[PDB]
C-alpha cells in the first residue's frame, strides 16, 4: 500500500489535536531528524477502578508498508505480567491479528484503547505466557497483588 506513510502522517496529525486523556503516541526519529512513522513509542494508562490503575505502560508500535491492510506489531517495553502478553512483550489480541478482528479502519487510537481494555479483561483460555496464567488460575488474589505492584512500579512522575 502506498498509503501507509501518508495515513500514519494523518493519524499523528489528528492525534495531536484529539486523543484520549492519559495516553501517549509519539513516532520516533529517523537519524536525519524526520519522524519514523513505522516506529512509535506509546504509553497506555491502567484503567481507573481496576488493579491496573496508576501505572503507565510503555508500548512500541511497529508498522510496515502494507499498513493498514495489516495491523502493526505492538510490544510492551519492558514485557508485562499479563496472560495475553508474550515474554517478548508482544501483545496478543484479536484486533491485532490480520484475520480475525483486524480491519483497515481500525485506528491507533482504537488499538491503544483496545490494548487498554485487554489489561483487565484477559483471555485465560489461550494464554501467551506461563507465568501470568499460572498465578491467575492458582490464586486470583495473588494475581491481583502482582498486577497492583506492577502498576505502582510503572506509576509515572
Amino acid at each position: 500500500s502506498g498509503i501507509a506513510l501518508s495515513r500514519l502522517a494523518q493519524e499523528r496529525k489528528a492525534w495531536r489535536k484529539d486523543h484520549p486523556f492519559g495516553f501517549v503516541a509519539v513516532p520516533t526519529k529517523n537519524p536525519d531528524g524526520t519522524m519514523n512513522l513505522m516506529n512509535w513509542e506509546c504509553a497506555i494508562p491502567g484503567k481507573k477502578g481496576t488493579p491496573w490503575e496508576g501505572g503507565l505502560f510503555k508500548l512500541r508500535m511497529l508498522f510496515k508498508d502494507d499498513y493498514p491492510s495489516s495491523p502493526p506489531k505492538c510490544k510492551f517495553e519492558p514485557p508485562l505480567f499479563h496472560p495475553n502478553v508474550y515474554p517478548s512483550g508482544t501483545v496478543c489480541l484479536s484486533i491485532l491479528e490480520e484475520d480475525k478482528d483486524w480491519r483497515p479502519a481500525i485506528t491507533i487510537k482504537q488499538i491503544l484503547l483496545g490494548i487498554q481494555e485487554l489489561l483487565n479483561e484477559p483471555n485465560i483460555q489461550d494464554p501467551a505466557q506461563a507465568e501470568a496464567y499460572t498465578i491467575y488460575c492458582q490464586n486470583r488474589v495473588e494475581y491481583e497483588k502482582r498486577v497492583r505492584a506492577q502498576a505502582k512500579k510503572f506509576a509515572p512522575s
Binding site: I3, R7, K13, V26, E41, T107
Partner: protein, 65 residues
C-alpha cells in the same frame, strides 16, 4: 406512523470523506477540522516521547476539569 428515528449523524465534507476513503480511515476521522476552535496550523513537530510523558505531570485520569 413509527417510533425510533435517526435525526442526526456526524458527517464530513466531500473532501474530508475522500481522504478518509483513500486512507481507509473512518469517514468521520477528519471531522475535528470542522470544529470552531480548530486552527488549520500546528507547528512543526519535533517533540520526543519523554517530553510528552513528562507533560502529563503524572495525572492519568480525569476529575472536575
Amino acid at each position: 406512523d413509527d417510533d425510533v428515528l435517526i435525526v442526526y449523524e456526524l458527517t464530513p465534507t466531500a473532501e474530508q470523506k475522500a481522504l478518509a476513503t483513500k486512507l481507509k480511515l473512518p469517514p468521520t476521522f477528519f471531522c475535528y477540522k470542522n470544529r470552531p476552535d480548530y486552527v488549520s496550523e500546528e507547528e512543526e513537530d519535533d517533540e520526543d516521547f519523554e517530553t510528552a510523558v513528562k507533560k502529563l505531570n503524572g495525572k492519568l485520569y480525569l476529575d472536575g476539569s
